[model samples]
Target chain A: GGTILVVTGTGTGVGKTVVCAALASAARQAGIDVAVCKPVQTGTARGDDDLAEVGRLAGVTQLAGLARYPQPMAPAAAAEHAGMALPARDQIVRLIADLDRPGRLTLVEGAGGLLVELAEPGVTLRDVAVDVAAAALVVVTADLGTLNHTKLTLEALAAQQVSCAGLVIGSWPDPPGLVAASNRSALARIAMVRAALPAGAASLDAGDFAAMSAAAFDRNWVAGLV
Target chain B: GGTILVVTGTGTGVGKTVVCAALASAARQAGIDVAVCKPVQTGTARGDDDLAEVGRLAGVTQLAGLARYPQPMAPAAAAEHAGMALPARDQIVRLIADLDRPGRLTLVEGAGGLLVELAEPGVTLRDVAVDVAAAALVVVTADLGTLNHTKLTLEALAAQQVSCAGLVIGSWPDPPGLVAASNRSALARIAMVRAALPAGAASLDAGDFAAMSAAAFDRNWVAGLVG
Candidate 1:
């Protein structure tokens, strides 16, 4: 099996999807085969398709998804509003296991934060990571409360004995203010900051995005992912 | 020893000061002696004074503070920017402990979230709670992403064997939208929501604020907190 990483965030709107695309693009540029899997996605009515975003941003055609809810809310609530049940834990694990191959980097993007219920019976991304033996690449922000949220996420991952692939500051704002700079330094103390994707990387054309992704992360580290 | 309840939040600016004032008001109205301790106060340069708010809102004068940082950042960063050091863990613990007395409810309002560093060597409100044998009253938001943050804070508190007093939705929106409404119901399943203060409770006059605080939390629970 290849490296399976679950892209999770401290909370919603922390740019988890963009980080997934950036890491996928970086890994692809590193000469590794990349497959992005979003098992559960919400806010489809608002044109929120994480897999599609990854495909467009990273030029990766291999994408997988199990459930999509229309409401822009947590998976459990969104599924309920849609009058549907979230994908079963076994079904999700099976999907990721099938996506795993010897030479591919499989990225499983979580819905919302790490502990948001992605499946039945309170199953979270952390539980699924334990199921698939995947490390977690936590996407965080440079906002005021980010350190607490990031520390909470990493502690939850460590509690499950999950290997943390490191943190990604999902949006590295230009002219990083005092708070962002302080948070960036504080976040590094918790985990290695694998990358800090420039703000607005998603809006860039494919050519520019690829270049940004390739340079946002260290070449050797992206090469070592697999 | 008296009851020491640390008023902490899922994140900063989640109405922690208002919750602290509200709870302190409710306990005071229950004829219980109340004291509020702010170990580290930040953003003083911007006129962020939590103890003053508690005093004006709750009418409890027993307020204590240890360190003050002018920057409106986390305690560690604010201390660093001020060319100062965070208060030692002992200072925070001793302050809260000194505030504790029989038939009194001492509220220790934290700087940020439960895991936020309030002292040197990476001390937190959770750590101080463990030292003082206090339960934590977590103040949270009713907006999106609140459930996860609330759960994470509760898990962290439980990890340290810190008893959670309950959760307070610091801001309950007027005519809550779909997301906020959904989060409130789900939040109840995880832990008891002590109260959902109306939006802008802090801006209310002393009379209106006291009236709101009286009805927000259950009277028995407020009374039980002291004795």
Candidate 2:
């Protein structure tokens, strides 16, 4: 019912967590009440680590509900192991309620890449994103190797009929290497993967995001995306 | 009616060659005549290296013929670039013909992952495999990121109606990479994967294979894999 942002990446370790944190931080700074949630969490305790980390870094005092799996395995598998079936479409109502709580925007992060199956044989996080009607942001870390992941992710997203806002380059320990610049251009030819958040430049804190206006978000960067 | 094993994989880099070589080697050890062939090569002139390496490691002297593209692109792209039509059924027919020439067991490997396309808006390699009537032995690599590739590949082979003998684990590296072990288990549990090969063991050759006994292969490992 509100502006919802979905952050995903080509693969894990591409900073879906960091970007979600930044978005949360930015929403609060923009004087807009914001809430964040992850559909599936593995590895850490109930994904409290990721939730808590994002909360602390983003300065989000009001944290919403969090669900986690024992190992960092896919949520479907973990849930199936515990004899719990994914609530599916019914689960979104609560997430939506959390977002509609007088907030300017609500940011949701998917557990893994778009194609990652939340349910065995059929359900994917992309399905949930669609169910929520959120504008998708594919977080692609700026690196040469991203070309394949980016292409595959973008194609997969498109193939699944998921509309996307653009792509954001998540934190890369090193600078953009190899096809970073060129792949960005190549992405232009593909779907809407345009915005490249400098390796770790995107801040969820409103002040940092406010420092650079939307115009300053890089027209060429955005241009390449559309 | 000899043992004609079809080596398949869930995705690329999952050790198709290793299992093929290992099985071929095992066949040789059992005093079975064996040979191997890759119908299409998609990368470079040296792209045949993996097949060649299999020949070297498996010691299968009867190993022969590599057909593929030069750029490591898919067969469709390679075929288009060469300005030649990728042989439709002839490709498989030719390879099978070569293998038909007096062998007790022949190992045939498909290019890329199952369900991968080479020449078209429609035709895929899985179609080719089914067309050739080869029983598939889907190979899943022991790596961190194989679950989706594995599941999708298996589903694809099933969807294509490609008859499969079983699943095999080829290049299982250390640490079991989470996804690899999980996939192996998942495949096995569902009766999808038939056999699992040794971890990180490279290509299977024939001559060296002739010395191997059935015990060299884990019979229990192959227990669930059925056509």
Best by TM-score: 1
Q: Which pairs clash (backbone N, Cα, C closer than 3 Å) in model 1?
A: none
lDDT of 1 by residue, A83-158 (tens): 9899999999999999999889999999888889999879999999999999999999999999999988888888
lDDT string for model 2 (B17-133, tens) is 777777766665556677787776666754555577677667777776546566554565556667766656665666666675443566777766665544344455566667666
Lowest lDDT 10-residue stretch of candidate 1 chain B: B23-32
DockQ leader: 1
Residue-pair clashes per candidate: 0, 27
Measured against the native two-chain assembly using Cα atoms, what DockQ does each of the candidate structures obtain, in the order listed?
A: 0.85, 0.15
lDDT against the true structure, each candidate: 0.92, 0.60
| Whole-model lDDT, model 2 | 0.60
Error of 1 at B109 (Å): 0.1
